[PDB]
Design a protein around this ligand. Structure first.
Ligand SMILES: O=C1Nc2cccc3cccc1c23
Ligand SMILES: O=C1Nc2cccc3cccc1c23
Lengths: 158, 158
């Protein structure tokens, strides 16, 4: 009786932090969705430090502490995902964490750029993926945070 | 006598692979520089597979096998570094590898964008760093592959 109970935790990776509201609207939506399932969101801006290295270390620790990352790999400042988010996905991959990704634009990279090269003649990947192939681990690329979260619930039970 | 001798290895992360020559000119320069010091370059396109997941896995393994990563975080398709490279930097950080980064543009992000926000009113980081703060671990940001390599030689001896 009164055994320890693990509360599931998801690291909320993505460029919402750069919204004018520092991601408040996104994180609030995430908080409400996860609350219903007794899942804790690990949010990049929580208890935010002032020094870059401290912010970075705390985020790395959240990834170490999580059961899954849900990463927003939507276009950021062009057709490419946010590099901070990409770093976090790599961290999670190395730590053998469940990584779930979504994007607002699921078109292949070559469809996005409209060619096999960009405007400067740099190669656009041709693997039938919406973004850099390093970011794809075989799990479906979802359309939304919600759809990724449904996969989490089905595949990481309490 | 005849003890095993470790050959130092560096993972060569960066968007050179997207050059029209698939990085040949960049990688050849790297190869020539490293051979002089008996250091082996681990190059993303070496023995390249055909399936995205196989390429990804081989690159992650190269990072697991390396002594350091030297990562080209130069502007790619705008002021942001390449997300594949960022993923690799994250992978290396999680694995406690030495990570050395360089860029052709060392200006602060706010100097690059000319404002604290981009054209779409999205926040530009203000930490006096040239790129997303997740990509900075306290080691100096170098100006070139060569200067990063000099740090490697001074800080990872045979
Ligand atoms: O790159 C970032 N990772 C982060 C985690 C938490 C907060 C903030 C704020 C600005 C920029 C970044 C950031
Ligand atoms: O995103 C990539 N990581 C890679 C590692 C090695 C080769 C190639 C080729 C195209 C695209 C990518 C790539």
């Amino acid at each position: 009786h009164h055994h320890h109970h693990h509360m599931r935790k998801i690291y909320i990776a993505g460029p919402a932090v750069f919204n004018p509201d520092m991601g408040a609207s996104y994180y609030n939506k995430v908080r409400e969705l996860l609350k219903k399932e007794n899942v804790m969101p690990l949010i990049p801006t929580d208890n935010e430090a002032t020094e870059a290295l401290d912010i970075r270390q705390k985020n790395i620790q959240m990834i170490k502490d999580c059961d899954a990352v849900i990463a927003d790999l939507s276009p950021f400042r062009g057709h490419e995902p946010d590099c901070g988010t990409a770093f976090e996905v790599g961290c999670a991959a190395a730590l053998n964490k469940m990584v779930l990704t979504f994007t607002s634009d699921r078109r292949n990279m070559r469809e996005k750029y409209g060619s096999g090269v960009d405007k400067d003649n740099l190669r656009v990947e041709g693997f039938g993926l919406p973004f850099n192939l390093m970011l794809y681990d075989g799990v479906e690329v979802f359309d939304s945070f919600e759809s990724a979260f449904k996969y989490f619930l089905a595949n990481f039970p309490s």
